[PDB]
Amino acid sequence: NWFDITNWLWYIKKKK
């Protein structure tokens, strides 16, 4: 789902 991509981006950007 393309609509879930930015949530993934937000999580990976928060983590590291």
Partner: antibody, heavy 122, light 109 residues
Framework: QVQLVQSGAEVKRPGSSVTVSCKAS????????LSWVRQAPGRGLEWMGG????????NYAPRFQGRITITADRSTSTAYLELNSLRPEDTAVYYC???????????????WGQGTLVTVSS | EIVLTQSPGTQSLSPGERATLSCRAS???????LAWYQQRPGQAPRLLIY???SRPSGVADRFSGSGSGTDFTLTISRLEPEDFAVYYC?????????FGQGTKVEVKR
């Protein structure tokens, strides 16, 4: 607060191509999804497609695939919709819409531009 | 493609009445990614509910979303004058997002 400001109304001849712009301010541009939604006179909303600027990843509705290009320019925080081979049934208000946040993106469209009336006519 | 059906397309209701608006999907909506919008004539749509039941800050708590899978409902607990407007549902649980055709809530007299 995020604000989206679109370019103004345009009259376009049948068969031509239109570019509509959407300039964002007040938030982070690159990592949030920006979509285009249109509304023909007296009709409902129709999702056309969207872009995630950082990744240059577009996602178009099959109805428009082959006739639409959505692009984003981080240098000016502006997104663009191109729609080609215009016909009278493309007369509509075109809106850009950006996903909301809680911040964490929510997918649904919290932030809308003011709309751009594109009239396809001779 | 997921088809969203909003039926009926108009509801005639009285001020102060409860409204329930249905959205039925042709197949299960992934992760309950279903949003509701309000639109008034001359204005852009406004987000009321996302994720089937979550309400953005600023949205009146008289609006509530419920449901899952293929059957979603927007409830307006008590219609205020400004609530007479058009409501759209939208699913974004697949890359091809789709809208319902809308339901106009109009004043019964």
């Amino acid at each position: 607060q995020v604000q989206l400001v679109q370019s103004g109304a345009e009259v376009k001849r049948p068969g031509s191509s239109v570019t509509v712009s959407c300039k964002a301010s007040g938030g982070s541009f690159s990592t949030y999804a920006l979509s285009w939604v249109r509304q023909a006179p007296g009709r409902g909303l129709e999702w056309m497609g969207g872009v995630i600027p950082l990744l240059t990843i577009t996602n178009y509705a099959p109805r428009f695939q082959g006739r639409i290009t959505i692009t984003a320019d981080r240098s000016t925080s502006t997104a663009y919709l191109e729609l080609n081979s215009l016909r009278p049934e493309d007369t509509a208000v075109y809106y850009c819409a950006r996903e909301g946040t809680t911040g964490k993106p929510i997918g649904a469209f919290a932030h809308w531009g003011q709309g751009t009336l594109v009239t396809v006519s001779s | 493609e997921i088809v969203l059906t909003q039926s009926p397309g108009t509801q005639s209701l009285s001020p102060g009445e409860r409204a329930t608006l249905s959205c039925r999907a042709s197949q299960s909506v992934g992760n309950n990614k279903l949003a509701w919008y309000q639109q008034r004539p001359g204005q852009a749509p406004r987000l009321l509910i996302y994720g089937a039941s979550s309400r953005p800050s600023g949205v009146a708590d008289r609006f509530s979303g419920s449901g899952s899978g293929t059957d979603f409902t927007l409830t307006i607990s008590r219609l205020e004058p400004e609530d007479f407007a058009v409501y759209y549902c939208q699913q974004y649980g697949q890359s091809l997002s789709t809208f319902g055709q809308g339901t106009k809530v109009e004043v019964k007299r």
